[PDB]
Structure formats: structure tokens, C-alpha cells
Amino acid sequence: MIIVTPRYTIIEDGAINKIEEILKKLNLKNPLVITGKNTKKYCRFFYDIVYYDEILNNLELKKYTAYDCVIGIGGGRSIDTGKYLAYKLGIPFISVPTTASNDGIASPIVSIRQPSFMVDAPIAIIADTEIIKKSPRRLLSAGMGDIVSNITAVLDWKLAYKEKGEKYSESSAIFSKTIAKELISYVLNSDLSEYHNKLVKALVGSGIAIAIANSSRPASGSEHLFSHALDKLKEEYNLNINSLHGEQCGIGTIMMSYLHEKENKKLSGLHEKIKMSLKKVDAPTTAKELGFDEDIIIEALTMAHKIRNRWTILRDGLSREEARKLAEETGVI
């Protein structure tokens, strides 16, 4: 085991004011800040600020030598780009999310050049829930899709263990699955007044599970494959759909869950529960809401397995009619 986790995690109103404090604790003196256009107001303690596009337009090294860490502030592009650059410079990364739409906040995954790959987990995570609470509702709702997908990811991971002898950690699996279960239970039973707070905790916890298992397995399975497949097709058919990753994964979760349910009667009804919790926080549950033609969903399901060399309930592949059947049995079309 060689495991990298965060050193400091903060999740509270006002958190953004503690960046200084944390840098001091970590004995970090000169951070490079990676951020975006409309987050410059949260950056007013620092001096070296770079926008993520500068980096993304040339992903290649000896002009950053003076910096001892990187601080990513803002949305997902900001955090992912900052994480990437820290990895490249071999220095620690500090995650300061202003949104909470996915688990890149705390995870050691970089999703700049899909496929994703594994780097070090951020050394600190500073999640100001006063700021995150005011992020676009749509991004918060999409966070739900990212969390519920731990369920199918864990089911796929067990399946891969059983059927293919893949490395599996029961205690990471259960942690990741339970994080999502608690979040689902909260959205189904509360007034949702603390959702943002609990979403962030879930996203973060889910990040830790990944670090702890040294794999994205506890957080990503066939539902994510389905999502990547959708993305390919948006590009390949030049669609203009503004669809978010977590929205897509949530819907992938509904469906993949149903495939598991067929094989494992003990899980029957799980997909309806996931469906419910997504509805309850305003997250899409069908292609129409998501914005797609039915044929794209079907095609995406049929080509999900090929996306990555990762065993899942999809197995050797779905047929176009198994696909349709699933999508319609499932309410997605």
C-alpha cells in the first residue's frame, strides 16, 4: 500500500478565508493560483494568478520553478487544470472549490485529457459552503448524479472481483457505497435545507475512497462508461447539448442499476430509488430532460463497454435492442 490522501480538509461557511492559515500549516510560501474569469473576487489574497485556459492551450515546464504549490479556485475546469499542473510540476495542489458538481474536488483523478488518470490527491481541500450554496442549482443537482453512481460503481467492482479476479477492497467499496446511501437517505427524508453541505461532504468522502483504494473503482463504473459514450457522440454528431457529467452519470446509474437488479433479485427496486432521489433534487432522469434523442442513448449504451478496459455489468456488450429495452424498461425513453 502506498496511499496519498489530503492532509487538511475543511468544509464550512467562511472556509475561503483560511487558505492563508492552511498554507502556513503546510509550510507553503508561494502558491500559483489557477482560477477562472468570474472567480477573481475570491482570489484577492494572492498575486500570481493564471487562468485555466492559458494552461489548456499548451499542456506542456521550467517557468514555474519558483512556485511551491498550486491552488485551484473555482469550478471544475479550474480544479482539474490546477491538479494537472501541480502533478506536472511535482508540487502539492490545494483544492478550493466554489462549485460542487462532481468529485474532482477531492479526488486524485485528472480529467483533462480523457481518459482520466490518477495523480496525488489534493493536499488540502477548502470547501466554503457559503460560496458553494450560491452556485447554480443545476450544478448542485448534478452532484447528486456523481454521488449516486458510487452504487453501480461498487456493484461493478464486486462483479469484476468475482468474475475476473480484479483487485477489490471490501472496506473501500462499502465506504463508497455507504456515502451515497447516506446522501440518498438525506435527500429522501429531509427538507433539503442542508443539501449543499451534505453533497460536498459526500463528494469529498468519495474522493477519499478513491485515494484509499488507489483506484477510481469505488466511484466510477459502467454508468460513467455510458456517460463517456454520450460525450463521444455529442462530438461525433456535433450536437449542441449542454449536458453535465453528473446528470449523465445519474441517468447511467438508473439504467446500470437495473441490469444488476435483473441478475440479483435482492437489489430489485434500487433503480427506482435512485430515480427518486435524483427527481427530488431536480436532476434529470430521462433523455428528454437531459436533451437527447432516444437513438443517442441507445447508441451510447451499445458502445459503453468499449470505452475503457474495465469489466462491468455490461460485460461483453449490449445489443441495440437490449439497449432500447433497458432504456424503456427504465423510463429513460
Q: How many residues does the chain have?
A: 333
Nearest approach in angstroms of CB 3 to its own copies is 4
224 is in an annotated binding site: yes
**275 touches which of Zn ion, Mg ion, its own copies, none (CB within 5 to 8 A by kind)?**
none
Q: Rounded distance, CA 182 to CA 129, Å?
A: 19
Return the number of the residue (101 or 129) whose C-beta is nearest Mg ion.
Answer: 101
**Among the residue ranges 41-49, 68-76, 138-146, 156-164, the one whose residues contact Zn ion (CB under 5 A):** 138-146
Number of Cβ within a 10 Å radius of residue 136: 11
* Contact status: 80 vs Zn ion (CB under 5 A): no
Residue 227 labeled ligand binder: no
**Residue 260 marked as a ligand binder:** no
146 touches Zn ion (CB under 5 A) = yes
The pairs formed by 184-191 with CB atoms below 8 angstroms and a separation of 24 or more are 184/147, 184/148, 184/273, 184/274, 184/277, 187/144, 187/277, 187/280, 187/281, 188/273, 188/276, 188/277, 188/280
The residue from 100, 139, 219, 327 that contacts Mg ion (CB under 5 A) is 219
Q: Which residues contact 155 (CB under 8 A, 6 or more apart)?
A: 221, 256, 257, 260, 267, 313
Q: Which residue is nearest to Mg ion (CB)?
A: 219
Q: Would you give the binding string for its own copies spanning residues 68-87, x where CB under 8 A is met? A: x-------------------
CA distance 212 to 56: 29
88 binds, among Mg ion, Zn ion, its own copies, none (CB under 5 to 8 A by kind): none
- Cα–Cα dist 254/62, whole Å: 47
Contact region for Mg ion (CB under 5 A) — 107-115, 118-126, 141-149, 272-280? 141-149
Which residue is listed with cell 454521488? 147
Question: Annotated binding residue at 107?
Answer: yes
The CA-CA-CA angle for residues 157, 163, 165, to 5°, reads: 75
In the block, cell 433523455 appears at: 287
Binders in 13-52 for its own copies, by CB under 8 A: 27
Interface with Zn ion, residue 156, by CB under 5 A = no
Q: How remote is the C-alpha of 84 from its chain's centroid?
A: 16
Place of cell 499548451: 58
Q: Of these partners, Mg ion, Zn ion, its own copies, none, which one is at the site of residue 4 (CB under 5 to 8 Å by kind)?
A: its own copies
**Between 202 and 225, CB nearer to its own copies:** 202
Contacts to its own copies from residues 143-182, by CB under 8 A? 170-171, 174-175, 178-179, 181-182
Which x/- pattern over 105-134 shows residues binding its own copies (rule: CB under 8 A)?
------------------x-----------
Amino acid at 29: K
Residue type present at position 209: A
Is 207 a residue that touches its own copies (CB under 8 A)? Answer: no
Residues in contact with 222: Cβ distance below 8 Å, sequence separation at least 6, in sequence order? 152, 156, 252, 256, 259, 304, 305, 312, 313, 314
The binding track of 142-161 with respect to Mg ion, each residue x by CB under 5 A or -, is ----x--xx-----------
C-beta separation of 122 from 94 below 8 A: yes
Question: Cell 460560496 identifies what position?
Answer: 131
Which positions touch Mg ion (CB under 5 A)?
146, 149-150, 219
Footprint of Zn ion on this chain (CB under 5 A)? 146
Report the binding-site residues: 76-80, 98-101, 103, 107, 146, 224, 228, 245
> Which residues does the annotation place in the binding site for substrate?
103, 146, 228
Site residues, its own copies (CB under 8 A): 1-12, 27, 68, 123, 170-171, 174-175, 178-179, 181-182, 201, 205, 208, 212
